């Protein structure tokens, strides 16, 4: 990797995209600009903050990407303590600016390996007080070697649980109560796995990651990428949405902020994965107390879910996602309850239409499929 410059025009393009889209821009600053004593040289960042200030740009900040690999990337080793001091410097800059109540996140470390905890721990000790969230990164696979079986493998999905537990071990030891974010996450590194990271098959790892993240106390999950060269893009090079886009839209429609818990009875149950939230009641179809279950079936046969008492006679809306043929799990097209999901036009998303089930029916979930189920009139007081 070699240095590049970017323009006011570049910043304007990115800010406008975010602002017109209703998204909150987080901008990563260059942490490899160093003084002789290997302090962070903040002077380029001061240029950028002044320009953003001058334009009234409402922006949040990070400093550095994956510091534990700085020696590999640039032959510069920055320990966690120094990075903490750098974040303190950046915090002071932000507080002396129009960005005085702008947010700061870091340090965007990779997932826990033999000794990546030392950097995150010494970083949180040193600079933990000035960050609004702890950001780390997670990938399951190498895009070069990943197989279709890896994408469908419950043992691959489950390794994520230990990554999360190891991160929370470091944070609880140094900054208990600090919000933990996945600041960069996807299926496969090296730009994704061709014909896997951009297909219906990607949805197992994406929905399971969202389920486990919410269940285990991760507050924000940042999908690599919305759009770009990587096969793990949610939108392709023709600006067409891939199955993970539709999955992400359906998740946002149905899933509320209050996380609950579902589990399957039986000795091992790794292939039937289940998650439970309060329903998103912005939807006028649903009301206070409604539940959203979501479920992944990685068995090669249909499974039938029985809701526990007292929800076994409730009206349930099914939102079942399956690939549009002929490429099955390797399809870049997806059907919701047997209707293909396509933009109505370049300005217009389709409705996402439920399939009501007859009250008292088991929830049918076909082989290698994922579904949302809204339990109507659930009247769960925890959901207010």
């Amino acid at each position: 990797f070699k240095n590049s410059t970017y323009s006011r025009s570049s910043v304007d393009v990115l800010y406008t995209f975010a602002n017109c889209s209703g998204l909150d821009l987080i901008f990563g600053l260059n942490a490899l600009l160093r003084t002789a004593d290997l302090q962070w040289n903040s002077s380029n960042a001061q240029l950028l903050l002044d320009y953003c200030s001058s334009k009234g740009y409402n922006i949040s900040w990070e400093l550095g990407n994956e510091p534990n690999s700085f020696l590999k990337k640039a032959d510069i080793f920055i320990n966690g303590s120094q990075l903490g001091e750098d974040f303190i410097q950046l915090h002071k800059l932000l507080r002396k600016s129009t960005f005085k109540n702008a947010k700061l996140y870091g340090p965007d470390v990779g997932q826990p390996r033999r000794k990546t905890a030392k950097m995150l721990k010494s970083f949180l000790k040193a600079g933990g007080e000035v960050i609004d969230s702890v950001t780390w990164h997670h990938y399951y696979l190498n895009g070069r070697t990943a197989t279709r079986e890896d994408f469908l493998n419950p043992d691959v999905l489950d390794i994520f649980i230990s990554s999360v537990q190891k991160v929370f071990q470091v944070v609880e030891s140094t900054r208990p109560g600090k919000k933990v974010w996945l600041g960069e996450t996807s299926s496969a590194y090296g730009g994704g796995a061709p014909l896997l990271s951009d297909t219906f098959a990607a949805g197992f790892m994406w929905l399971d990651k969202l389920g486990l993240s919410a269940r285990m106390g991760i507050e924000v999950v940042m999908r690599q990428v919305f759009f770009g060269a990587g096969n793990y893009h949610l939108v392709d090079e023709n600006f067409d949405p891939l199955p993970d886009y539709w999955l992400s839209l359906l998740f946002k429609k149905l899933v509320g902020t209050k996380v609950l818990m579902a589990s399957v009875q039986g000795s091992k149950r790794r292939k039937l994965r289940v998650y439970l939230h309060c329903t998103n009641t912005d939807n006028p179809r649903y009301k206070e107390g409604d539940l959203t279950l979501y479920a992944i079936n990685l068995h090669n046969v249909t499974k039938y879910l029985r809701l526990p008492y007292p929800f076994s006679n409730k009206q349930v809306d099914k939102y079942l996602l399956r690939p549009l043929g002929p490429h099955g799990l390797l399809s870049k097209s997806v059907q919701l309850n047997g209707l293909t999901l396509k933009m109505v036009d370049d300005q217009t998303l389709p409705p996402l239409m439920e399939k009501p089930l007859r009250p008292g029916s088991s929830l049918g979930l076909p082989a290698f499929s994922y579904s949302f189920f809204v339990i109507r009139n659930a009247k769960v007081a925890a959901c207010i």
């Binding site: 590049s4 759009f227 009875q265 879910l305 370049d346």
Partner: protein
């Protein structure tokens, strides 16, 4: 078949966690800023319709190239 029927347990007593409304957020890799078509692409009205669909969300601009990008107030 009987073996294909599975019973769910639910915990509903209290919220176990509260995620952000922005729980599902997205990135643009810092490397996209080196693409000459950067202005064309993020200008796409179609792309903006799709991004507005994910609102609310953080958009994180970052990646390996974060630590190899330099603001030039003079260029372009």
């Amino acid at each position: 078949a009987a073996q294909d029927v599975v019973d769910l347990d639910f915990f509903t007593q209290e919220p176990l966690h509260l995620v952000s409304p922005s729980f599902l957020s997205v990135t643009i890799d810092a490397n996209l800023a080196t693409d000459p078509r950067f202005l064309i692409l993020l200008g796409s009205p179609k792309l903006r319709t799709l991004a507005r669909g994910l609102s609310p969300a953080y958009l994180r601009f970052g990646g390996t190239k974060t630590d190899f990008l330099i603001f030039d107030p003079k260029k372009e």
